[PDB]
């Protein structure tokens, strides 16, 4: 026989690994961790069952990481180089998908017969979520407020969704939290624009994208057209970076996402005390969490 | 309520199918779904499983190009530009990921156990097979001819192993197929490194830097020599350095060596078909002119 | 005394206008004084006035192909180089800047009081007509086909209007030549943008990212089809990508809608040829062979 | 009929101008202001003339630096980004030509027969010093500094010279003016010229200009070609740039300028004193003025 | 011992070497070596000097290809890629200074104590050459065709009088040839310079910025037309640029007037001949056929 | 006759000459003079033949800079910016070229039968070392440090091993110095890769440059491939080459480097005792020239 097919060898593997590895090297916020441990004080999900997954859920997050990385065409991650910039875009992708396979081998150990499909519905969620992000940011078209926040449910939404949904379906209570979870990402996300430009510098501008405030600000008189250009430009430089900022301010649109986030933070509230009157422990977890997103 | 969430629209679907409706309605030889069909002479699985393995198969297949080429960096797929030299990378990227899942939904359809191990471990391969070329690739080390083709075994037949593995777990006879069935992925594979030197633009794979059959004999050929490397190194797009470094694997008799090996797999191919027909099974004509359609 | 001025030079000039020189002595079709002469068989300016306004306009047309040829990153005018890629984009632009100014420096020469607000009145629309379409183009937003000639007759009529008015300012008849004269700058750039695509570089409004008329058409005909407006985005030079479009924009059948539209608009001008002369007019042949000329 | 022709409206005229409002909205030293002011202490134009005078000059002069950055590759401007990095090339560019024929309405107002000829030979001297700099530059062919001098004459004289034509042509009294007036712009740009080296860093040699003290360092020792080799690189970094400074230094090229200014600004005090001696009142601000370009 | 220093191998000689043994392999003219021949029936080296003349001559042409190709920034040699665009300008520019020290190696072998002295004294002329070549090229000022020639023989030249001289000082003739020898490397020069652009790629002395002959005579012969000279500052890749400067050039009548140049040259270097034959030498054919050979 | 062959000029000479030049204005370390300074204690060259030496070591090792600079790709030169980016790349190519032949002129000079051969088979060795250290930097193939060793052997040979040997050539004693010499050059080079890691910063991850360290880290652990694909990618920012600073400490191959140069010095220093004990006066200057290269 001319062809003698060989086994996968653990050298090979930490090959296709090399970008993977990298990334869970960098220490970052353990927020899906949190967020996990804090609604298993209701859910209690077996020990066994609770780490595959939490496995999971770490493997769905770094190779999103990896592939976001490269589609929003990011420079740093966690301070340090981000991934592809190292290893260069097609490794780094390919790190990226061969995970997400790994996990779906992962998440076949659970051995419940509803697990698929909410992994697949999941990631359908999260695709769209980015999907329609890249399509504003690549048409110039900036979306409506409510356009933002139906695509931020679906992206960041998608992976707190899976942990939560996982973990309910290994659970058994029957309380519906995803609710309340599409709520957290929500705030958890217009945290994140907020920060991004409030704290490289200015890096959502960079990669052009309708961020929360950015789209406020662009709305709020739409007869000046200054940062909507400068979106188009991309730009490396701190001198634009710092000009945009500042009209950004003149808008009042960080006073106006504060507002917001606060808006939130009390229909959060509102409903995790709606659900503990309901029979369910006072969680701390999940209020310090809460406080974790702050402005 | 502050946050009312909404449903997903059809002009929704349609912007995040942008680039795979755009590669799908480009023509294609269609080899995989002839393949397919070649097979089912023998598992007789029925129409409506079949379509399911059909459109699965089309979707992941469409959703690698979309990736691959951005990964290898192509110009021209099917005579045509690459999705992402109109949509972008991202949007490109995105769609091909969102593909990937749209097909894990659809094997669901089949409701058969051991499709989603199926599905599951053939992706792995694929992943395992672009992994280690792109690792060749990107150290400029050339591989072995063994390497490379364990290698084409997990990236050429990863899918054509899920077409048949399905299949297989529809039917209830009890023949493996399978090493048949990536012996024919790797002839496929070996005849598109030849073709894309001799007959997507002038020689494509010297601009992309990959490590293909011919060109590894060339190398292997004679270490002392490193004009052939060294151009794959400055991935060129020059129509005037592709000319020399084909012209340099003429006399390096690679094209021989490479039509030399199809040879000896083709026959290896037909032993094989052979032997399974004289177990109980009905003489296949359709194979055999795949096998025959695949040839230089 | 330290400083002691100088008297402006005739090798001095020559730098100036080598950008506009070198423009000027590439052969044109010269369709503006043909229509100037067309109208004068109306207007019966005498020759001495006459030879300032073709000087004027000529001066005028030169000196916008000279910048507009930067804005819109031309790569050919007349077949030859832009002026910019031989002299460099600032003393092109310069160039341009400077016959602007000797225009108005040569309009004096009328006389005329009403030849100022004639002339800045007839530049404030060119420089609106660009300054909508660039704004479009940079937008990436499609506009309608009333506000694209709403743009067009600003732009292109813009400088076939001041060529007219100052015509009438010199002559004593009481007639309004001007609606006339603008629906034919229309039928021109209609023309224009059709001949890019079908017939200055392969398509080159393809690679300036210009919303013409019949590429608006495609776009509009079916807005859950986001290839041709991605394909302007991306601005491309390669002719796969350009010819990609071309047959995309076949297949909505804008270049019949396009035929069409300038056929109705060329009974209109017609039309109103033929009321002008009924009101006291000689017949005028020119003008209607100037028409046909502007066909396809 | 198939073609109805709609009016002009207040917002397309905003995105016209877009650019425009921008470069008017960062804030700069008011130059062209207390040159006019304190000539009018000796012209006394009428008000309503003046005004007229002013925005024509305004609106010149901002449309001349949408254009001048983009011939000059520049970065900053009044120390915030320049237009054309916001709007990008072709809108700049067309903001200002549009701007070119608003200021030529403007001028229309003050109903003078002689008016539009000044406008005209003003900015024919612009162009034409504008364009020998291009020259010099795209040729690396340093002039002499009479050459400069004749150079910028035209240049900042063009407009300093379009002001105060239009101010005389408008006032009863007939004293010539115009000699002291470019004496004023040559001091003015030799400052510049200065000032942009000894004060981006160095912007003046990453676009290549044969700016004055350059000049001097490039003639004073031919043998060396340094300097001149550098302009040629157009070099974007900064060890480059302070290799030139200090070379520069060595052939006492800032000690020649300041020179120079000192023995301009000696004649245009003796102009001025000549000038208050023939009837004129002492006029202070304009002493003052000439204070304010110092080294 | 903690170092213990090593042999070199073969196989680092390889490498050393690898863009020197790719561009001897592309064929060649090799005119050099057929005046070599066509001298030697004067001076009558004998033959075992004679191989280690040639061979030092050879070395360092190809040596000096390898150097000057990055300088000039060339995109073809011989009709197929510069060895730098295959083994990257820094190998290559060592392989070039590499193998000018094994130049000097071989030039030992004369055991000749005047040989030093004439292969320092040719390459400082080459280096002086390409200096001020490369100096009028940076500054953009043309040089007068006095200077051009000047520099032509030291840098052409330097290398012609190289081979003689070392030959000269293997024959115990006491005459002169070098004034003879120089005449003839202006004159192959010219020819190049004229054949760059009428018959490497499309101009690419255009391309390199060069001030070429002809493209003197043309920029000198009207200095208040900008074209020519601006062009080179662009060092333009695009045809239709090329093409334009070409018909400058053509309507200057410099093609003419070079053709006209190398015919008086030619005449000079034919009575040089046949005075040296004049002086009790043998009829040379071979150098007569060599002059011709060098012609349109 | 229709040519004339003209003179070489000075003004000529100072064009070829501007890049040489402008290197050796700039100050540098004293390094080659210290070193033939020290050794003369021994040899006692005359003084006429000492300064035709030192002539040519001076050319030989400026000629050097100009093209390794090149070579290298580097982008600054003892602090100022490199010679390439004020004169183009041709030109400081071919001032380097023309150098090299000036110095051979030079080394004539002794009229010594010998030098030629001396002066060849150093140059050689130059260019074979750098010669191969261009192979693995282009080929992505890290080296074994006996390879490295020789390799820099022939580099930092090379030209310290011609000026001992000119001098032993000019020498009345027969006391064969250069394996001395080749420890020496080896030491100053391992010290030179570890200080252009530690002390632009870190410019030998810029060029790709598989340095003494950078082998030791990339060898000692080939399952991590982070740091060799660093060098393929080349960086010029300042993250990614501090991410590669941390990894090299976090593998001890700076401590490695450390003890190596130790071992080294120890065995330069029995040398040159071994070598006094056969009655030559103890080098002092030898000593400290031996202490500069420490860590």
Known sequence: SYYQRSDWTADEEQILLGPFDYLESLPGKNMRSQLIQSFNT????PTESLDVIIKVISMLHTASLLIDDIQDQSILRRGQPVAHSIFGTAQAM???????????????????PKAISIYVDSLIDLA?????????????????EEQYLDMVANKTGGLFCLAIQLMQAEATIQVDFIPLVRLLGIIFQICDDYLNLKSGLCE???????????????RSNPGNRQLINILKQKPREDDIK???????????????????????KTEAI??????????????????????????
């Open 42 to 45: 209701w859910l209690k999900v």
């Open 128 to 144: 769209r979520g980015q999907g329609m992000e890249l399509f504003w940011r690549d048409s110039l078209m900036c979306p409506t």
């Open 94 to 112: 390919n790190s990226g998908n061969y995970v997400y396979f790994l996990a779906l081998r992962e998440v076949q150990k659970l051995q419940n």
């Open 242 to 264: 710092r000009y945009a900022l500042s009209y950004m301010e003149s808008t009042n649109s960080f006073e106006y996402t504060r507002g917001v986030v606060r808006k939130l």
């Open 204 to 218: 959502d501008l960079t990669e052009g994208k309708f961020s929360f405030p950015i789209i406020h600000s662009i």
């Open 270 to 295: 509102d409903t995790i005390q709606g659900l503990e009157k309901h029979g369910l422990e006072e969680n701390i977890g999940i209020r310090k969490i809460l406080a974790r997103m702050s402005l």
